[PDB]
């Protein structure tokens, strides 16, 4: 069982069989000098052991999931509704475009001005903030249900509930990645 | 290209690679490119550190 | 002060004026390519290409653009042989102006960072000396090394998004750009399948990713950074270089074997299609198709196509040339115009004779009639004072069928020598040493060419990688050795 | 070690029994080098002795067949194996060694276990150069015998036909592989064996006039007529005199080397500028890209019958060289020449 | 009259067709 | 002596940051040695079945593929 | 003694004897 | 005020190799240029 | 040590190698490889 | 399927194994007992 | 210790390599006088050149079926 986890977090479980959140030592080696007008040029030494990102981890599995979270409740439902693959999706919209049997006014060259306008930009204004619980939370609009007055810090587990549906739909997005061009 | 056909001709006539004394010139030219690259570097692999690395050992 | 082999050397301290240093190589490589790619298209004789194409030209970046999908011109022509109705902007024109201004901005780029070379980013902090980060570096480049192989392997060749390779037939008669399929099974190990390269790229593009995001996070052991002396920018030198030669020798070697990646309707046959019988037993496979079904000799022969001819020739083998016969096919034996029939011999008791094929060893072959056993019954003697088989008392006769000498029956024993004498050549064909002063000895084709300089780059640079690794570990004594270093004998 | 104390593990145990002053130096080279090399010599002697060559060549090559140390060789595989490695467990050999050494598979058994040896050797002399703290000139010197046989026993094969016209490993072999170069490739006439001629047989001169420019102009250090005695290696002064030497030769040849460092860099440098030059030359001809013909004295002498140089009678001595050798030395060709159709001078 | 096979062996000897197969 | 700021030259600046930083040890070169000796035996995969010295049937091994 | 300046020598030595063992014979192999 | 100015230099020893393997390459190369 | 003189080692050792290579020209004039 | 080939050539691969580890263990064995 | 000189010259060298050595010749002269050299490196005894198959020169011409083919060609 591991050591550096378990404790301030939802999936608190040692799963890690390699440890890739592990805090590992750094020592640091000196420049090594390139002056052709010294005689001799050595390679360097250890100058500096430096004592040593979970909260780094933790922010990067959460957007994967809840861009896994949209798209594994978004392909059922456009294979259910309009009828077609969600593989098929891009060959059927770039003739035409349509959203449930609808009818849409735009080419497929405004797709990429608009979401690299729109999907870029909020992209761009996600990572300007600098704190690593506010970056994994944030409050403010998307949080319109308080979930921010509950706590989570002790054994209740208020928190801990996107987190197991974010592992499985990666997991079944993944399941959909070896099912669509194999079988 | 007279010295190639001289060289031609006299393989012929008298088989100057199967003869020994040529072998044993041709061990004195592949042994002389050997010694001449093996006393030659060595001696380059062994210099006193005299000069920079912004000139020339030859200094 | 340095000497002339050492003057690129002040570059070594500082990685702003390696940056321009490289950019200007950069301009350099791309400004001789759409130079070069101007003077192929100006000299190019777009008219035949059934029996005049590319590598018969002495074309040589011209089957580079044309592999990847650039068929077409801005002077109507096309490479399939019809006018292109809507060139594109991706012309060959197009391309070899796309690296001219290429070539220009990376001028005027390797101007900017040698001026502003002394760039706070290549000081790393708290030291304030110059300084790279050469296992990130590594992780950057890496990334988005395989960024374009995924790129190029899913979207370029497999036709997701791009044109598409070129892909022949075996025979190299009906030769496009189309679309490929990946293939993941065995089959896509098999060099000659062009599936298998998109699904390299994919494959590779995927690991190389996977790989270059390794490379960005995980920093190196200190163990394996000084023995592989990672804090000099000479380490990565030496070990590119070994990465290149490599490389090189992987390139000239499936040129000059061929592969999917090197169509033989864009460089030419292989030396080993001549010597295996590749385009013989086809066309013998074709004309016992049609003698088998019922059909006369010269209404067989008819039926095979003239670029198939065409390649059963020793004139378009690359390795019949010299080093120094330069230039085109096209200037050694003369344009081919017309294939001129299938020279069919046959003696004076009614049986078939088969004229010896000369090796590819050999400038000169003596010409050899052999039976359908494979005993000789005829031949142009060198001694003629007391001759057993000569073609005069064997009394051997030549008949074509096809070509332009169809039906037509020789039996002179001055033109059936001549015949006989173009016949181990291969098919026999009609050329003209008038329209570029033909020298009459043949040339390799930029198959052969390609694969000469790209083994005697890959074996000048095993030498770099030689001295360069040297540089490296020996880096402390490269100036000479200490006073007091007789501590290591007994 | 390290100068940061980590606490060795099992590479440091095995770092120090390697790199171990001892009788024959081992060291981290000594895992490739030395079973490689014993290979290769133990393939070459075992080959040579017992290995016949009557089925890849129809011509006998050991001592147990009737050779002596000239004609005895290791004999390259059949025209038919093209470029099969031919691994004893190989789709060829499969398994059985006494029709692997039939097949000529231990052809490739000393040219590979000899290539890979060759990397050992090298690695050899930049691994003890660093355990001594000197200059790896030693190292980059053997890159042109590494040249000179990569170029050759490899690279020429895979450009040809197959592994049979390689050198096959012997003294006789070589020869005949010397003499298929002039008759089909007019090797002497390419520029890059001309600069190999002048690299090979201009180091022997260097090493001929070094040796005797230092052991006649030595200082008088002993008081006997062996001027060998008069030395210690832990001497700091010159044992000859560098001033006589260059006032000899400036004289003599009128051109001298002031610079001892110089000289023996250039000692260094003729060998190995000349075998890669020639290498180069080697690696044309692998793709047949000879320097065979000079097409402007082939023309005048086609269109006049009275023009003879030394060139066209090389010329005319390579198409007697590829003739009548060509019915046995490619017998996969299965040529057969009538006597009258081979070319001929007069009463020969 | 001929077969393919031996009329590939007369002309060049070293083709695919004769070389592979040809234990018979 | 500063150097020269420039725009890109600090959205670039933590990628050219840790330069002389290293793990302790052997770290992941015993994971290497397991990734070169896999890419050691699959160069030997694709050098024998282009030498025709690894056979599988499924492939041709010869021009003829470009027909299937 | 097993060492490595013994198994130098005799890595070379003992099959040299072995075949020149082997080469004598070689010389009174009539036919 | 680059820090990495450096200085080419080639003696006259140096110019009588470099003009003689010039003009040796182009004795021996240009007959085969010439062809 | 010394036990046997090094020359006399040397002599009757260069002596059977002399001998033996005067086997392997005897060799070369009768049966194999004698060309008769 | 598995042709003999490819049989030989994957137990080349673990007689690769056993020739190259064996010279592994050897000199791992006289680096620590010392024979 | 031991600078091949005290080797040479001691009698302990010469009472094992007075024994090993003529019995390793001997060794090598059975390997060949019992035939057994012509069996293990399948070099053709000079009887055993020309079968009454063929009076020529073998030759292999046949890549992948050549094991069996030199069996052929050696007449076993
Ligand atoms: C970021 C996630 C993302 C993923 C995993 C995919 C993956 C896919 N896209 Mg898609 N896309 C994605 C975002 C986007 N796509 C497109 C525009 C398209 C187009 C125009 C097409 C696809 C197609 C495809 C599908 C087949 C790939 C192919 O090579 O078809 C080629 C193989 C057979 C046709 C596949 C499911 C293709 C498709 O739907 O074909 C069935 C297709 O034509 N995508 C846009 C811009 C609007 C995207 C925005 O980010
Ligand atoms: C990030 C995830 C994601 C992505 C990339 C897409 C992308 C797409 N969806 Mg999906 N979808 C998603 C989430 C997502 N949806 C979710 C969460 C739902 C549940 C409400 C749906 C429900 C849904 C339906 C019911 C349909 C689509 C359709 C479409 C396609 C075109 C319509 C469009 O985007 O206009 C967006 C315009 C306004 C919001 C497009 C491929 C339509 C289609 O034609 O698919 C082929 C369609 O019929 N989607
Ligand atoms: C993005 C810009 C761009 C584009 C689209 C092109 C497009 C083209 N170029 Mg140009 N070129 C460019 C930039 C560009 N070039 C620049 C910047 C240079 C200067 C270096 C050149 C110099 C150049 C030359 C000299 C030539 C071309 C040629 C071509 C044509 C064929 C390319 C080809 O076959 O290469 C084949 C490319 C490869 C085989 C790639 C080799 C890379 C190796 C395999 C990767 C090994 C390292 C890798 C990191 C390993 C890790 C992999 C994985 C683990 C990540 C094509 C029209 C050719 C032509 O016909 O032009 C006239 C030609 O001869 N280009
Ligand atoms: C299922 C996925 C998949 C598929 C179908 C392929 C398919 C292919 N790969 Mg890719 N590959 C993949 C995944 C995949 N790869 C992945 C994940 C990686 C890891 C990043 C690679 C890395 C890779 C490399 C590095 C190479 C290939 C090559 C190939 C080709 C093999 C056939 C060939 O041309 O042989 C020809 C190649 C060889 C026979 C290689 C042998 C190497 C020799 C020994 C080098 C000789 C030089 C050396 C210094 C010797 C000295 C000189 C000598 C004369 C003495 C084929 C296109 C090869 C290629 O592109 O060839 C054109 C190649 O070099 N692949
Ligand atoms: C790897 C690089 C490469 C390759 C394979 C080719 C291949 C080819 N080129 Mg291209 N070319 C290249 C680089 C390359 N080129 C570059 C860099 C340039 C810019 C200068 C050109 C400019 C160019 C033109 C302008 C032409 C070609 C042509 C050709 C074709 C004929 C080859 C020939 O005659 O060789 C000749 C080979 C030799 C003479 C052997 C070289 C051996 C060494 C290098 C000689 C040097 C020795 C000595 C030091 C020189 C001093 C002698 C002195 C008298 C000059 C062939 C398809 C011709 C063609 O067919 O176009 C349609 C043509 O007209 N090329
Ligand atoms: C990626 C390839 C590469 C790179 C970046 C370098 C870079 C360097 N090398 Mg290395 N080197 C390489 C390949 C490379 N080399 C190869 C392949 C060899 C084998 C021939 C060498 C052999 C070598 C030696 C022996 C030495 C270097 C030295 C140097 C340094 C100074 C070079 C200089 O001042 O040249 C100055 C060159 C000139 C002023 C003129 C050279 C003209 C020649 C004839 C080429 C003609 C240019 C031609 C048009 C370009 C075609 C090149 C071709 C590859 C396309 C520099 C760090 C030196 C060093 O380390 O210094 C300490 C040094 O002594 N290199
Ligand atoms: C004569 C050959 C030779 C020599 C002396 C060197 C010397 C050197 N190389 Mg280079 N290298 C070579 C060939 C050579 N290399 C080849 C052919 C490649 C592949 C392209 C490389 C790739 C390479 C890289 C990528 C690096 C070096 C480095 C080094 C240096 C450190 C020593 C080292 O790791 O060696 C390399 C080790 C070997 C050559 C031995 C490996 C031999 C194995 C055991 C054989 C496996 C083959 C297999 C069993 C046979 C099956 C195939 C068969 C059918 C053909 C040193 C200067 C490093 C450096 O510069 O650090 C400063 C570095 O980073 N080398
Ligand atoms: C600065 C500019 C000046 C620099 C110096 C210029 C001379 C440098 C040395 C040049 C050497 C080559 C000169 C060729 C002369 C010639 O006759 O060309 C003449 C040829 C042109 O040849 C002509 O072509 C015509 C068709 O366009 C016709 O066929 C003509 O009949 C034919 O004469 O020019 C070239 O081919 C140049 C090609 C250069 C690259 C060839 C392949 C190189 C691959 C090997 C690379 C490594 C080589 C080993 C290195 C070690
Ligand atoms: C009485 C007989 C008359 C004299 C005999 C003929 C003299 C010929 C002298 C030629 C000198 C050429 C030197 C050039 C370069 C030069 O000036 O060298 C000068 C050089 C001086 O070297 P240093 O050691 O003094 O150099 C110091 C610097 O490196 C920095 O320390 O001397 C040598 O290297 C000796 C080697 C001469 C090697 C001679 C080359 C062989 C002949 C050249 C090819 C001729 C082709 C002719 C074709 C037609
Ligand atoms: C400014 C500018 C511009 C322009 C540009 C240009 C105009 C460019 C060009 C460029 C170019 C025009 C380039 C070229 C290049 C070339 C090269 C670079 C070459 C080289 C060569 C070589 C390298 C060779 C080599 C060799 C030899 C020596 C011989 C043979 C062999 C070999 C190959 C090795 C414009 C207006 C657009 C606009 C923008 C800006
Ligand atoms: C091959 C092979 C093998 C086996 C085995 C081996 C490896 C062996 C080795 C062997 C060896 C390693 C041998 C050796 C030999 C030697 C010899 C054979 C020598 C001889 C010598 C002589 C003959 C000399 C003479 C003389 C002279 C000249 C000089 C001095 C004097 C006298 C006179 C004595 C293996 C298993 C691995 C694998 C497979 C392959």
Same mark, same amino acid.
Not at chain 3, 244 to 261: C, H, L, Q, R
């Given at each position: 069982?591991?050591?550096?986890?378990?404790?301030?977090?939802?999936?608190?479980?040692?799963?890690?069989?390699?440890?890739?959140?592990?805090?590992?030592?750094?020592?640091?080696?000196?420049?090594?000098?390139?002056?052709?007008?010294?005689?001799?040029?050595?390679?360097?030494?250890?100058?500096?052991?430096?004592?040593?990102?979970?909260?780094?981890?933790?922010?990067?599995?959460?957007?994967?999931?809840?861009?896994?979270?949209?798209?594994?409740?978004?392909?059922?439902?456009?294979?259910?509704?309009?009828?077609?693959?969600?593989?098929?999706?891009?060959?059927?919209?770039?003739?035409?475009?349509?959203?449930?049997?609808?009818?849409?006014?735009?080419?497929?060259?405004?797709?990429?001005?608009?979401?690299?306008?729109?999907?870029?930009?909020?992209?761009?204004?996600?990572?300007?903030?600098?704190?690593?619980?506010?970056?994994?939370?944030?409050?403010?609009?998307?949080?319109?249900?308080?979930?921010?007055?509950?706590?989570?810090?002790?054994?209740?587990?208020?928190?801990?509930?996107?987190?197991?549906?974010?592992?499985?739909?990666?997991?079944?997005?993944?399941?959909?990645?070896?099912?669509?061009?194999?079988? | 290209?007279?010295?190639?056909?001289?060289?031609?001709?006299?393989?012929?006539?008298?088989?100057?690679?199967?003869?020994?004394?040529?072998?044993?010139?041709?061990?004195?030219?592949?042994?002389?490119?050997?010694?001449?690259?093996?006393?030659?570097?060595?001696?380059?692999?062994?210099?006193?550190?005299?000069?920079?690395?912004?000139?020339?050992?030859?200094? | 002060?340095?000497?002339?082999?050492?003057?690129?050397?002040?570059?070594?301290?500082?990685?702003?004026?390696?940056?321009?240093?490289?950019?200007?190589?950069?301009?350099?490589?791309?400004?001789?390519?759409?130079?070069?790619?101007?003077?192929?298209?100006?000299?190019?004789?777009?008219?035949?290409?059934?029996? *005049?194409? $590319?590598?018969?030209?002495?074309?040589?970046?011209?089957?580079?653009?044309?592999?990847?999908?650039?068929?077409?011109?801005?002077?109507?022509?096309?490479?399939?042989?019809?006018?292109?109705?809507?060139?594109?902007?991706?012309?060959?024109?197009?391309?070899?102006?796309?690296?001219?201004?290429?070539?220009?901005?990376?001028?005027?780029?390797?101007?900017?960072?040698?001026?502003?070379?002394?760039?706070?980013?290549?000081?790393?902090?708290?030291?304030?000396?110059?300084?790279?980060?050469?296992?990130?570096?590594?992780?950057?480049?890496?990334?988005?090394?395989?960024?374009?192989?995924?790129?190029?392997?899913?979207?370029?060749?497999?036709?997701?998004?791009?044109?598409?390779?070129?892909?022949?037939?075996?025979?190299?008669?009906?030769?496009?750009?189309?679309?490929?399929?990946?293939?993941?099974?065995?089959?896509?190990?098999?060099?000659?399948?062009?599936?298998?390269?998109?699904?390299?790229?994919?494959?590779?593009?995927?690991?190389?990713?996977?790989?270059?995001?390794?490379?960005?996070?995980?920093?190196?052991?200190?163990?394996?950074?000084?023995?592989?002396?990672?804090?000099?920018?000479?380490?990565?030198?030496?070990?590119?270089?070994?990465?290149?030669?490599?490389?090189?020798?992987?390139?000239?070697?499936?040129?000059?074997?061929?592969?999917?990646?090197?169509?033989?309707?864009?460089?030419?046959?292989?030396?080993?299609?001549?010597?295996?019988?590749?385009?013989?037993?086809?066309?013998?496979?074709?004309?016992?198709?049609?003698?088998?079904?019922?059909?006369?000799?010269?209404?067989?022969?008819?039926?095979?196509?003239?670029?198939?001819?065409?390649?059963?020739?020793?004139?378009?083998?690359?390795?019949?040339?010299?080093?120094?016969?330069?230039?085109?096919?096209?200037?050694?034996?003369?344009?081919?115009?017309?294939?001129?029939?299938?020279?069919?011999?046959?003696?004076?008791?009614?049986?078939?004779?088969?004229?010896?094929? $000369?090796?590819?060893?050999?400038?000169?072959?003596?010409?050899?009639?052999?039976?359908?056993?494979?005993?000789?019954?005829?031949?142009?003697?060198?001694?003629?004072?007391?001759?057993?088989?000569?073609?005069?008392?064997?009394?051997?006769?030549?008949?074509?069928?096809?070509?332009?000498?169809?039906?037509?029956?020789?039996?002179?024993?001055?033109?059936?020598?001549?015949?006989?004498?173009?016949?181990?050549?291969?098919?026999?064909?009609?050329?003209?040493?008038?329209?570029?002063?033909?020298?009459?000895?043949?040339?390799?084709?930029?198959?052969?060419?390609?694969?000469?300089?790209?083994?005697?780059?890959?074996?000048?640079?095993?030498?770099?990688?030689?001295?360069?690794?040297?540089?490296?570990?020996?880096?402390?004594?490269?100036?000479?050795?200490?006073?007091?270093? *007789?501590?290591?004998?007994? | 070690?390290?100068?940061?104390?980590?606490?060795?593990?099992?590479?440091?145990?095995?770092?120090?029994?390697?790199?171990?002053?001892?009788?024959?130096?081992?060291?981290?080279?000594?895992?490739?080098?030395?079973?490689?090399?014993?290979?290769?010599?133990?393939?070459?002697?075992?080959?040579?002795?017992?290995?016949?060559?009557?089925?890849?060549?129809?011509?006998?090559?050991?001592?147990?067949?009737?050779?002596?140390?000239?004609?005895?060789?290791?004999?390259?595989?059949?025209?038919?194996?093209?470029?099969?490695?031919?691994?004893?467990?190989?789709?060829?050999?499969?398994?059985?060694?006494?029709?692997?050494?039939?097949?000529?598979?231990?052809?490739?058994?000393?040219?590979?276990?000899?290539?890979?040896?060759?990397?050992?050797?090298?690695?050899?002399?930049?691994?003890?150069?660093?355990?001594?703290?000197?200059?790896?000139?030693?190292?980059?010197?053997?890159?042109?015998?590494?040249?000179?046989?990569?170029?050759?026993?490899?690279?020429?094969?895979?450009?040809?036909?197959?592994?049979?016209?390689?050198?096959?490993?012997?003294?006789?072999?070589?020869?005949?592989?010397?003499?298929?170069?002039?008759?089909?490739?007019?090797?002497?006439?390419?520029?890059?064996?001309?600069?190999?001629?002048?690299?090979?047989?201009?180091?022997?001169?260097?090493?001929?006039?070094?040796?005797?420019?230092?052991?006649?102009?030595?200082?008088?250090?002993?008081?006997?007529?062996?001027?060998?005695?008069?030395?210690?290696?832990?001497?700091?002064?010159?044992?000859?005199?560098?001033?006589?030497?260059?006032?000899?030769?400036?004289?003599?040849?009128?051109?001298?080397?002031?610079?001892?460092?110089?000289?023996?860099?250039?000692?260094?440098?003729?060998?190995?500028?000349?075998?890669?030059?020639?290498?180069?030359?080697?690696?044309?001809?692998?793709?047949?890209?000879?320097?065979?013909?000079?097409?402007?004295?082939?023309?005048?002498?086609?269109?006049?019958?009275?023009?003879?140089?030394?060139?066209?009678?090389?010329?005319?001595?390579?198409?007697?060289?590829?003739?009548?050798?060509?019915?046995?030395?490619?017998?996969?060709?299965?040529?057969?020449?009538?006597?009258?159709?081979?070319?001929?001078?007069?009463?020969? | 009259?001929?077969?393919?096979?031996?009329?590939?062996?007369?002309?060049?000897?070293?083709?695919?067709?004769?070389?592979?197969?040809?234990?018979? | 002596?500063?150097?020269?700021?420039?725009?890109?030259?600090?959205?670039?600046?933590?990628?050219?940051?840790?330069?002389?930083?290293?793990?302790?040890?052997?770290?992941?070169?015993?994971?290497?040695?397991?990734?070169?000796?896999?890419?050691?035996?699959?160069?030997?995969?694709?050098?024998?079945?282009?030498?025709?010295?690894?056979?599988?049937?499924?492939?041709?091994?010869?021009?003829?593929?470009?027909?299937? | 003694?097993?060492?490595?300046?013994?198994?130098?020598?005799?890595?070379?030595?003992?099959?040299?004897?072995?075949?020149?063992?082997?080469?004598?014979?070689?010389?009174?192999?009539?036919? | 005020?680059?820090?990495?100015?450096?200085?080419?230099?080639?003696?006259?020893?140096?110019?009588?190799?470099?003009?003689?393997?010039?003009?040796?390459?182009?004795?021996?190369?240009?007959?085969?240029?010439?062809? | 040590?010394?036990?046997?003189?090094?020359?006399?080692?040397?002599?009757?050792?260069?002596?059977?190698?002399?001998?033996?290579?005067?086997?392997?020209?005897?060799?070369?004039?009768?049966?194999?490889?004698?060309?008769? | 399927?598995?042709?003999?080939?490819?049989?030989?050539?994957?137990?080349?691969?673990?007689?690769?194994?056993?020739?190259?580890?064996?010279?592994?263990?050897?000199?791992?064995?006289?680096?620590?007992?010392?024979? | 210790?031991?600078?091949?000189?005290?080797?040479?010259?001691?009698?302990?060298?010469?009472?094992?390599?007075?024994?090993?050595?003529?019995?390793?010749?001997?060794?090598?002269?059975?390997?060949?006088?019992?035939?057994?050299?012509?069996?293990?490196?399948?070099?053709?005894?000079?009887?055993?050149?020309?079968?009454?198959?063929?009076?020529?020169?073998?030759?292999?011409?046949?890549?992948?079926?050549?094991?069996?083919?030199?069996?052929?060609?050696?007449?076993?």
């Amino acid at each position: 069982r591991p050591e550096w986890l378990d404790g301030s977090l939802p999936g608190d479980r040692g799963f890690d069989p390699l440890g890739l959140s592990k805090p590992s030592e750094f020592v640091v080696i000196g420049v090594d000098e390139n002056d052709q007008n010294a005689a001799k040029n050595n390679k360097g030494s250890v100058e500096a052991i430096v004592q040593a990102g979970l909260a780094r981890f933790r922010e990067c599995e959460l957007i994967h999931g809840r861009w896994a979270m949209l798209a594994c409740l978004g392909a059922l439902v456009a294979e259910a509704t309009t009828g077609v693959s969600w593989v098929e999706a891009g060959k059927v919209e770039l003739d035409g475009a349509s959203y449930a049997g609808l009818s849409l006014p735009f080419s497929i060259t405004q797709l990429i001005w608009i979401e690299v306008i729109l999907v870029g930009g909020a992209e761009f204004y996600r990572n300007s903030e600098t704190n690593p619980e506010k970056r994994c939370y944030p409050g403010g609009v998307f949080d319109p249900l308080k979930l921010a007055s509950e706590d989570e810090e002790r054994a209740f587990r208020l928190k801990t509930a996107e987190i197991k549906h974010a592992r499985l739909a990666m997991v079944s997005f993944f399941g959909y990645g070896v099912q669509a061009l194999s079988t | 290209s007279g010295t190639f056909n001289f060289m031609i001709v006299f393989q012929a006539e008298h088989n100057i690679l199967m003869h020994p004394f040529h072998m044993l010139g041709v061990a004195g030219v592949f042994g002389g490119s050997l010694f001449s690259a093996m006393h030659g570097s060595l001696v380059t692999s062994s210099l006193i550190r005299e000069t920079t690395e912004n000139e020339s050992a030859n200094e | 002060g340095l000497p002339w082999y050492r003057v690129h050397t002040v570059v070594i301290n500082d990685p702003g004026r390696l940056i321009s240093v490289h950019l200007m190589h950069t301009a350099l490589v791309s400004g001789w390519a759409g130079s070069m790619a101007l003077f192929e298209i100006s000299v190019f004789d777009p008219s035949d290409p059934v029996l *005049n194409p $590319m590598w018969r030209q002495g074309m040589f970046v011209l089957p580079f653009m044309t592999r990847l999908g650039i068929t077409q011109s801005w002077g109507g022509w096309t490479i399939s042989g019809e006018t292109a109705t809507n060139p594109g902007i991706w012309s060959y024109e197009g391309v070899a102006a796309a690296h001219i201004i290429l070539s220009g901005a990376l001028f005027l780029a390797s101007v900017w960072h040698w001026t502003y070379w002394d760039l706070e980013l290549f000081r790393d902090p708290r030291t304030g000396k110059t300084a790279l980060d050469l296992p990130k570096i590594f992780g950057i480049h890496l990334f988005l090394s395989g960024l374009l192989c995924f790129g190029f392997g899913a979207f370029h060749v497999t036709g997701v998004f791009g044109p598409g390779i070129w892909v022949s037939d075996p025979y190299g008669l009906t030769g496009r750009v189309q679309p490929v399929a990946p293939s993941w099974g065995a089959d896509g190990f098999d060099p000659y399948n062009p599936g298998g390269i998109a699904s390299h790229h994919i494959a590779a593009g995927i690991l190389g990713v996977l790989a270059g995001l390794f490379h960005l996070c995980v920093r190196p052991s200190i163990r394996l950074y000084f023995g592989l002396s990672m804090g000099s920018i000479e380490t990565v030198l030496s070990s590119s270089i070994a990465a290149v030669f490599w490389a090189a020798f992987v390139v000239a070697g499936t040129m000059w074997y061929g592969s999917a990646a090197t169509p033989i309707e864009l460089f030419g046959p292989t030396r080993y299609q001549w010597d295996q019988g590749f385009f013989q037993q086809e066309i013998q496979k074709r004309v016992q198709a049609s003698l088998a079904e019922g059909a006369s000799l010269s209404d067989a022969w008819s039926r095979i196509p003239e670029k198939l001819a065409f390649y059963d020739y020793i004139g378009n083998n690359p390795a019949k040339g010299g080093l120094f016969r330069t230039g085109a096919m096209n200037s050694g034996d003369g344009i081919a115009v017309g294939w001129l029939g299938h020279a069919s011999f046959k003696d004076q008791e009614g049986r078939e004779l088969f004229v010896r094929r $000369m090796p590819t060893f050999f400038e000169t072959f003596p010409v050899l009639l052999l039976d359908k056993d494979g005993i000789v019954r005829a031949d142009v003697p060198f001694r003629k004072a007391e001759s057993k088989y000569s073609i005069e008392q064997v009394g051997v006769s030549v008949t074509f069928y096809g070509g332009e000498l169809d039906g037509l029956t020789f039996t002179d024993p001055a033109t059936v020598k001549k015949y006989a004498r173009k016949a181990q050549l291969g098919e026999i064909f009609e050329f003209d040493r008038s329209t570029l002063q033909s020298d009459g000895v043949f040339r390799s084709s930029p198959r052969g060419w390609f694969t000469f300089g790209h083994v005697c780059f890959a074996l000048l640079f095993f030498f770099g990688h030689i001295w360069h690794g040297a540089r490296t570990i020996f880096r402390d004594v490269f100036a000479g050795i200490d006073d007091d270093i *007789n501590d290591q004998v007994e | 070690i390290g100068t940061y104390q980590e606490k060795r593990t099992w590479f440091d145990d095995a770092d120090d029994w390697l790199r171990q002053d001892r009788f024959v130096f081992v060291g981290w080279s000594g895992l490739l080098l030395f079973p490689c090399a014993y290979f290769a010599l133990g393939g070459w002697l075992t080959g040579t002795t017992f290995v016949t060559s009557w089925y890849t060549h129809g011509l006998a090559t050991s001592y147990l067949e009737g050779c002596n140390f000239l004609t005895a060789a290791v004999s390259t595989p059949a025209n038919s194996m093209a470029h099969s490695l031919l691994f004893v467990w190989g789709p060829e050999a499969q398994g059985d060694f006494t029709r692997w050494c039939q097949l000529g598979g231990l052809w490739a058994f000393v040219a590979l276990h000899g290539a890979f040896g060759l990397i050992g050797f090298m690695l050899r002399q930049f691994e003890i150069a660093r355990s001594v703290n000197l200059r790896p000139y030693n190292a980059i010197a053997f890159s042109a015998p590494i040249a000179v046989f990569v170029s050759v026993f490899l690279i020429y094969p895979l450009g040809q036909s197959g592994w049979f016209f390689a050198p096959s490993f012997g003294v006789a072999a070589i020869f005949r592989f010397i003499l298929f170069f002039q008759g089909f490739h007019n090797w002497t006439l390419n520029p890059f064996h001309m600069m190999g001629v002048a690299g090979v047989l201009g180091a022997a001169l260097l090493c001929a006039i070094h040796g005797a420019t230092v052991e006649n102009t030595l200082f008088e250090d002993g008081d006997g007529a062996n001027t060998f005695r008069a030395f210690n290696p832990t001497q700091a002064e010159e044992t000859y005199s560098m001033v006589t030497a260059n006032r000899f030769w400036s004289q003599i040849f009128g051109v001298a080397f002031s610079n001892k460092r110089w000289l023996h860099f250039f000692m260094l440098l003729v060998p190995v500028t000349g075998l890669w030059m020639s290498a180069i030359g080697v690696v044309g001809l692998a793709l047949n890209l000879r320097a065979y013909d000079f097409v402007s004295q082939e023309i005048r002498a086609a269109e006049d019958p009275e023009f003879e140089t030394f060139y066209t009678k090389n010329i005319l001595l390579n198409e007697g060289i590829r003739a009548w050798m060509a019915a046995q030395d490619q017998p996969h060709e299965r040529l057969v020449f009538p006597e009258e159709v081979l070319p001929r001078g007069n009463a020969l | 009259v001929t077969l393919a096979l031996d009329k590939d062996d007369p002309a060049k000897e070293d083709s695919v067709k004769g070389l592979r197969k040809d234990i018979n | 002596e500063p150097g020269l700021v420039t725009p890109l030259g600090t959205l670039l600046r933590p990628l050219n940051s840790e330069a002389g930083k290293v793990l302790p040890g052997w770290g992941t070169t015993v994971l290497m040695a397991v990734f070169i000796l896999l890419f050691a035996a699959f160069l030997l995969i694709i050098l024998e079945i282009y030498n025709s010295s690894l056979i599988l049937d499924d492939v041709s091994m010869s021009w003829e593929t470009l027909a299937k | 003694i097993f060492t490595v300046r013994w198994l130098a020598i005799h890595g070379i030595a003992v099959p040299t004897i072995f075949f020149l063992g082997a080469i004598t014979a070689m010389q009174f192999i009539q036919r | 005020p680059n820090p990495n100015k450096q200085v080419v230099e080639l003696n006259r020893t140096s110019l009588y190799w470099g003009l003689l393997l010039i003009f040796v390459l182009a004795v021996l190369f240009s007959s085969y240029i010439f062809n | 040590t010394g036990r046997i003189p090094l020359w006399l080692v040397g002599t009757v050792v260069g002596t059977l190698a002399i001998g033996l290579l005067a086997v392997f020209f005897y060799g070369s004039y009768v049966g194999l490889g004698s060309s008769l | 399927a598995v042709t003999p080939s490819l049989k030989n050539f994957l137990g080349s691969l673990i007689a690769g194994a056993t020739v190259l580890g064996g010279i592994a263990l050897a000199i791992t064995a006289v680096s620590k007992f010392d024979k | 210790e031991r600078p091949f000189s005290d080797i040479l010259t001691s009698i302990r060298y010469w009472v094992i390599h007075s024994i090993t050595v003529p019995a390793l010749f001997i060794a090598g002269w059975l390997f060949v006088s019992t035939g057994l050299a012509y069996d293990v490196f399948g070099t053709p005894r000079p009887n055993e050149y020309f079968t009454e198959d063929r009076q020529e020169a073998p030759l292999i011409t046949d890549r992948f079926n050549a094991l069996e083919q030199v069996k052929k060609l050696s007449g076993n």
